[PDB]
């Protein structure tokens, strides 16, 4: 009756950052020692919570958010950060209690000639609220002229393809990111360590 952390970290395919997946974890026990002891993670940043002391705690809900971004954009997956990814794709609250775990996935997600399957939101009129997901493909109206769903002048597609060719630099290579959101309130428990 263990929590399905392997279904998230070792999933064959990750979602695009603009359509980041979230898995609800409840009514299970988990072993966090499989994390923070592995050497695969390039960045393992925790805010508010202690990953080392995670094995003897309990929580109500633990959300596992998954997506793929560039290495340059990994810094933006953090509370109080700004940028195209943080404002328009994935935003964390200023009181975020959890961990952001990232690693290099050049061997997995980077195809020869361009993956073209990972997209990010390029144009948006306002920034995202915390934990908001905008999966709209409506043509972005950059002027006063209506777009009528056809791209053109002042009318751009809101999403952009990452590319992800294996020969690019480390910054341009895809990075898989898993965001763990921890929450304790009332007393339902259902998410504890050993």
């Amino acid at each position, epitope marked *: 009756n263990l929590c399905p952390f392997g279904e998230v970290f070792n999933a064959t395919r990750f979602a695009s950052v603009y359509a980041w997946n979230r898995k609800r974890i409840s009514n299970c026990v988990a072993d966090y020692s499989v994390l923070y002891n592995s050497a695969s993670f390039s960045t393992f940043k925790c805010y508010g919570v202690s990953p080392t002391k995670l094995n003897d705690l309990c929580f109500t809900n633990v959300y596992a958010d998954s997506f793929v971004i560039r290495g*340059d954009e990994v810094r933006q997956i953090a509370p109080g950060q*700004t*940028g*195209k990814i943080a*404002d*328009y794709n994935y935003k964390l609250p200023d009181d975020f209690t959890g961990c952001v775990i990232a690693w290099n996935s050049n061997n997995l997600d980077s195809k020869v000639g361009g993956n073209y399957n990972y997209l990010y939101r*390029l*144009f*948006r*009129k*306002s*920034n995202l609220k915390p934990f908001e997901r905008d999966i709209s493909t409506e043509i*972005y*109206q*950059a*002027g*006063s002229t209506p777009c009528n769903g056809v791209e053109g*002048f*002042n009318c*751009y597609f809101p999403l*952009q393809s990452y*590319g992800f*060719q294996p*020969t*690019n*630099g480390v*910054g*341009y290579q895809p990075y898989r990111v898993v965001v763990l959101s921890f929450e304790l309130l009332h007393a339902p428990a259902t998410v504890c360590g050993p």
Partner: antibody
Amino acid sequence: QVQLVESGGGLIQPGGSLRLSCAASGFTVSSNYMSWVRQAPGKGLEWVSVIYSGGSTFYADSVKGRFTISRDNSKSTLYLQMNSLRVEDTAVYYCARDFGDFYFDYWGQGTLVTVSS
Amino acid sequence: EIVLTQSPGTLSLSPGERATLSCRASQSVSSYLAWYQQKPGQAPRLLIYGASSRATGIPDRFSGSGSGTDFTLTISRLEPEDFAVYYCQQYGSSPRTFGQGTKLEIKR
């Protein structure tokens, strides 16, 4: 049609402040990335600052903490408040519409900012 | 800070010939390069974006080529109004940087 007309350039002593205006036409300034690009006399181009369509602000290191880019949707104008100006800042400042923080597709006529004592 | 280097410093060709320009990058930028034309006393004008895509209103005689660290802008059948200073700009990594430009003058 897209028009970018700039104002505010002139002569200012070192440490003095100076504000640049950029009246825009042909698009909504609140929905587009906009950037300032300066060019020192006889030198190459240098990016200065950009404002995202969502209001996010980013500046080059050489001007960070001194310049402050801003927009006014009501008047359709892009501003660049240049404070604590230095002799090195002497350049022609261009106002350019930015396509997703990648490239500048439309440019203004350019205004000359001269910083000297 | 990633530096763009343009060659030649100045190019001299007669009208009707083919002009080839170079832009070499400090690091690979992966087709995140643009080309700008600037006539004396005017603002830069966008020519190529994406290192190969042609901007709206740009004649077919301008073509962008290259990837990674090496890029090339070619102008065929030079017209007298095609002679100016041409800049390359990368947008692979912040901050975005330009080049020193390449002066293109008519030979007589």
